Amino acid sequence: LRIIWGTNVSIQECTTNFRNFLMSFKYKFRKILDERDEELYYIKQLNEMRELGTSNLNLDARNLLAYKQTEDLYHQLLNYPQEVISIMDQTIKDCMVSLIVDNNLDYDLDEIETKFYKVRPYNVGSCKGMRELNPNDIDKLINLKGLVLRSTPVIPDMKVAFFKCNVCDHTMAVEIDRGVIQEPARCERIDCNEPNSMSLIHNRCSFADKQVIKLQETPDFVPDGQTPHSISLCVYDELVDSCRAGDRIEVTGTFRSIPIRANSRQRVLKSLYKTYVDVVHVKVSDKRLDVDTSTIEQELMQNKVDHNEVEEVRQITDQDLAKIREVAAREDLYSLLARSIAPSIYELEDVKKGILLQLFGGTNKTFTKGGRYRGDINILLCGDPSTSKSQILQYVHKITPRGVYTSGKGSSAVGLTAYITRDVDTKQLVLESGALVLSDGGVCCIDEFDKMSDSTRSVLHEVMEQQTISIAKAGIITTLNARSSILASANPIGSRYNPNLPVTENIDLPPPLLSRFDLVYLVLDKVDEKNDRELAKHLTNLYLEDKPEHISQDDVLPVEFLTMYISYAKEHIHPIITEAAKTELVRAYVGMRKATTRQLESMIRLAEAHAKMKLKNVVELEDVQEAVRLIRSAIKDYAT
């Protein structure tokens, strides 16, 4: 039965064990899912692999668990990841060849088999953070989450060393393999002998690429008293740069322990090993949270194709598409989605709705050059306290892929961009991305906006207009792009803002900044009697069930459908208002003027979101009506 010395993983016979599986699986997963696609996954998918030749079969883990056999191999993969992954790689290659010989001549012809096929297992285990982990698990597959603070530039790493001679000279080279380069003392040509120095020429040797991604993890389920830890994961090879800074990422990889020299002169090692993650697989996109835009991605589509890769942009099946294009037909859709956004949150539908358009906001324009008005639409909302105004922030924060959530007074103009901190790992000066730069794309959420210090808010006059930030300070001088929506919460002085008084006075703020916001919500309580009873019916529920179920029920609601819908809407639609709009469009603006020109900008952007929804490449003359009314909605609330 052979063995491997420490691994209790018998070479081969796990290859058989893996093959009967690989060739025959289908779905036993649904027996765990409980059921309620027919044919097996892997031969089909491995075929797609073989024509596309993308390599990188990423498996699942667990497809294995639960299926027999391989009930064991799952354990053997979680425990002894590297070796087992090497075995599996071999197996998959051989399975390729053996699959080819069935079809005779394949892909012209025998080359593609010798090309390296490798596994990127994912979805492995439910693990608790990083911090929780014992020294008992030094090498194991492990899951992580949480946004990415910074990433170093690519560090070159040896693969095949190179050597030349003083005599004669001869060019031969020793390959690294294990982690040291052992050079022959002497010699080749002459040989001889002779004890002549063997030169190492470092430009002729072959490298691979090792990057290092710092990571701020959220395990959630926080045991306390713990504060967020930071981690460093070294990627490798193709995965390099495949992760932008600020993303929320699912990455899996092998835990690791390495010493780091203390003196940097002496041979001495510091004991007390320093630990890090090796990140075999990254899982950027998610089902539960919304999908990134295309325009922002750009190059990483235009690039990452050439060297190829996997994952990135969320992919959609056909029949579900057939479901979206069906749901679009439903007339109450614009209403429907509005109730579906915040299930817990009751009434106040136009807030839910304006935000609904904040999710679809605008259409991006480059002109010949410059231009760049983006899709950005920005929303302040104020009112009596306990109105859920913060809850929305939480929710939008949860959905929006890249967004970042900031409190008032916990903020400073230095904090929102360009820290230029000391790195302290290398004892170097490294640039960090501020909070708005991270928030670039998607939605920045802001608490207690009224309360920001006077020096702050001086950042926003830059962002709101330019849509970029201009940093001339300190080390590096550049204008860097942050294109981001803003959703700001405000508490009027009252704090009940009260009848009469100038409202425009009663939000506080400088009025110029205040006029700048796209859509400004003012929420108020008319003490409907006749309301509080209904609302209490809503909230005083749960109650039952203790395990939360049927929140808004009975109400028709989409759940994961609305995210793939929203995504789809964003990437595959680019609305234009054509001719029909302009007349009514203008007369609205004048009607308001009879305020400032921004309000117009607002309307044409906000409206195009409406039209972005409903899958219309062109705006109707209709739909600009409510698109105004939303601005007028706050006016029906400005009467008092």
Partner 1 sequence: EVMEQQTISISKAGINTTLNARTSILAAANPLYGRYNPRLSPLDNINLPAALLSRFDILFLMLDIPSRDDDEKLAEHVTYVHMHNKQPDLDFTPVEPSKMREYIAYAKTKRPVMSEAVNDYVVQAYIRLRQDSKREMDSKFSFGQATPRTLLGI
Bind-site residues:
383-390
Residue number, 345 or 603, with CB nearest to ligand ADP? 345
Residues of the binding site for ATP: 383-390
Let me know: does 263 contact 289? Beta carbons within 8 Å.
no
Torsion angles phi and psi, residue 229, rounded to 5:
-75, 165
Residue number, 2 or 530, with CB nearest to partner 1? 530
Residue number, 196 or 390, with CB nearest to partner 1? 390
Under 8 Å CB-to-CB from 259, ≥6 apart: which residues? 269, 270, 271, 273, 274
Residues composing the chain: 640
Query: 86 is in the binding site of which of partner 1, ligand ADP, none (Cβ under 5 to 8 A by kind)?
Result: none
Instruction: Find the shortest distance in angstroms from Cβ 235 to partner 1.
Output: 22
Let me know: does 155 contact 271? Beta carbons within 8 Å.
no
Under 8 Å CB-to-CB from 209, ≥6 apart: which residues? 154, 155, 156, 157, 236, 237, 240
* Structural element, H or E, at residue 209: strand 206-210
Which single residue is written with the structure tokens 């959630």? 220
Maximum C-alpha span of the chain: 104
Residue number, 434 or 575, with CB nearest to partner 1? 434
* Structural element, H or E, at residue 640: none
Query: 501 is in the binding site of which of partner 1, ligand ADP, none (Cβ under 5 to 8 A by kind)?
Result: none
Instruction: Find the shortest distance in angstroms from Cβ 493 to ligand ADP.
Output: 14
What are the structure tokens assigned to 560, written together? 């994961």
Which single residue is written with the structure tokens 């039952």? 544
Q: How many CB atoms lie within 10 A of CB 268?
A: 11
Among 453, 416, 459, CA closest to 434: 416
Query: 540 is in the binding site of which of partner 1, ligand ADP, none (Cβ under 5 to 8 A by kind)?
Result: partner 1
Query: 204 is in the binding site of which of partner 1, ligand ADP, none (Cβ under 5 to 8 A by kind)?
Result: none
Residue number, 390 or 468, with CB nearest to partner 1? 390
Instruction: Find the shortest distance in angstroms from Cβ 638 to partner 1.
Output: 20
Let me know: does 419 contact 225? Beta carbons within 8 Å.
no
Residue 615: strand, helix, or coil: helix
Residue number, 183 or 525, with CB nearest to ligand ADP? 525
Query: 125 is in the binding site of which of ligand ADP, partner 1, none (Cβ under 5 to 8 A by kind)?
Result: none
Instruction: Find the shortest distance in angstroms from Cβ 447 to ligand ADP.
Output: 8
Half-sphere exposure of 283 (CA within 13 A, CB side): 19
Residues that bind partner 1 (CB under 8 A): 149, 216, 222, 224, 227-228, 384-386, 390, 404-408, 410-412, 414-416, 419, 421, 432, 434-435, 438, 447-448, 491, 494-496, 525, 527, 529, 532-533, 535-537, 539-541, 543-544, 546
Query: 532 is in the binding site of which of partner 1, ligand ADP, none (Cβ under 5 to 8 A by kind)?
Result: partner 1
Instruction: Find the shortest distance in angstroms from Cβ 560 to partner 1.
Output: 24
Q: List the helix and strand counts (H, then E) for the chain.
A: 21, 16
Instruction: Find the shortest distance in angstroms from Cβ 333 to ligand ADP.
Output: 22
Instruction: Find the shortest distance in angstroms from Cβ 507 to partner 1.
Output: 14
Sign of the CA dihedral with 577 first, then 581, 583, and 589 last: negative
Residue number, 35 or 220, with CB nearest to partner 1? 220
Residue number, 492 or 575, with CB nearest to ligand ADP? 492
Query: 301 is in the binding site of which of partner 1, ligand ADP, none (Cβ under 5 to 8 A by kind)?
Result: none
DSSP tag of 306 = S
DSSP tag of 213 = E
Residues that bind ligand ADP (CB under 6 A): 344-348, 385-391, 535, 539
Instruction: Find the shortest distance in angstroms from Cβ 471 to partner 1.
Output: 15
Query: 541 is in the binding site of which of partner 1, ligand ADP, none (Cβ under 5 to 8 A by kind)?
Result: partner 1
